[PDB]
Design a protein around this ligand. Structure first.
Ligand SMILES: *[B@@]1(C2=[C][C]=C([C][N]C([N])=[N])[C]=[C]2)O[C][C]([C][O])O1
Length: 237
């Protein structure tokens, strides 16, 4: 996260850190708890990943330092990538992780509600992007989960900032015209939480952008509301 600040412990209870154990353990992507056995994240996060066996999901984490060899984690039973996904910039950047075991909810780890189709007209004025990602295009994973408040931008506005790309309605952007605050490498798969009427909603999934926090280059996120039907289909046994 660029231009953000340290989050308060338990402030984003749905945020998880997804690690890969190959070659050695390290943070791979962010993700969001949306069900007792389900993590919603980004599809492009699994490039080069041929088995769920090397994945470890850690919930209730503030500092990466809390994760040690003796720290408990959730194994991944199955990685479900949207069948139309090809690459982040083309959309459909969404994936589900079916955990091997169930998450016991608590103040430190609980699910975030999905947006409803009846909230597309609603205007989110309190949105935040979070993660352990870079603080600059060239950096490294951060210890403390970072947070940054960022305004949503209309698709038409976003399309103007990405002439070489096609910003579809299945995408949603957020950023400041002057830049300064934005997601960055390592934040992928992270949630774009927005609080409306005292209730947090998972509005987007950190997907891509040109550089990080550059002027007139809004972050691009997967428009979650467009996948509630998909999520229901894939999570219902
Ligand atoms: B992701 C990833 C996160 C953020 C960016 C840049 N995004 C914005 N808005 N400037 C690119 C990639 O983090 C983990 C990595 C693994 O594929 O991708």
């Amino acid at each position: 996260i660029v231009g953000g600040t340290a989050s308060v412990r338990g402030e984003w209870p749905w945020q998880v850190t997804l690690h890969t154990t190959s070659p050695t353990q390290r943070h791979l992507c962010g993700g969001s708890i949306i069900g007792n056995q389900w993590i919603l994240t980004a599809a492009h996060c699994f490039y080069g990943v041929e088995s769920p066996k090397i994945l470890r999901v850690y919930s209730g984490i503030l500092n990466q330092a809390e994760i040690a060899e003796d720290t408990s984690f959730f194994g991944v039973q199955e990685i479900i990538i949207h069948d139309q996904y090809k690459m982040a910039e083309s959309g459909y950047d969404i994936a589900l992780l079916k955990l091997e075991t169930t998450v016991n909810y608590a103040d430190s780890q609980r699910p975030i509600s999905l947006p409803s189709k009846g909230d597309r007209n609603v205007i989110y004025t309190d949105c935040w992007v979070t993660g352990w990602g870079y603080r600059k295009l060239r950096d490294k994973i951060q210890n403390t989960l970072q947070k940054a408040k960022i305004p949503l931008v209309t698709n038409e506005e976003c399309q103007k900032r990405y002439r070489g790309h096609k910003i579809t309605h299945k995408m949603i952007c957020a950023g400041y015209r002057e830049g300064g605050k934005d997601a960055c490498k390592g934040d992928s798969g992270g949630p774009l939480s927005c609080k409306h009427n005292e209730v947090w909603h998972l509005v987007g999934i950190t997907s891509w952008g040109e550089g990080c926090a550059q002027r007139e280059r809004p972050g691009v996120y997967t428009n979650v509301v467009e996948y509630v039907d998909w999520i229901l289909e894939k999570t219902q046994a």
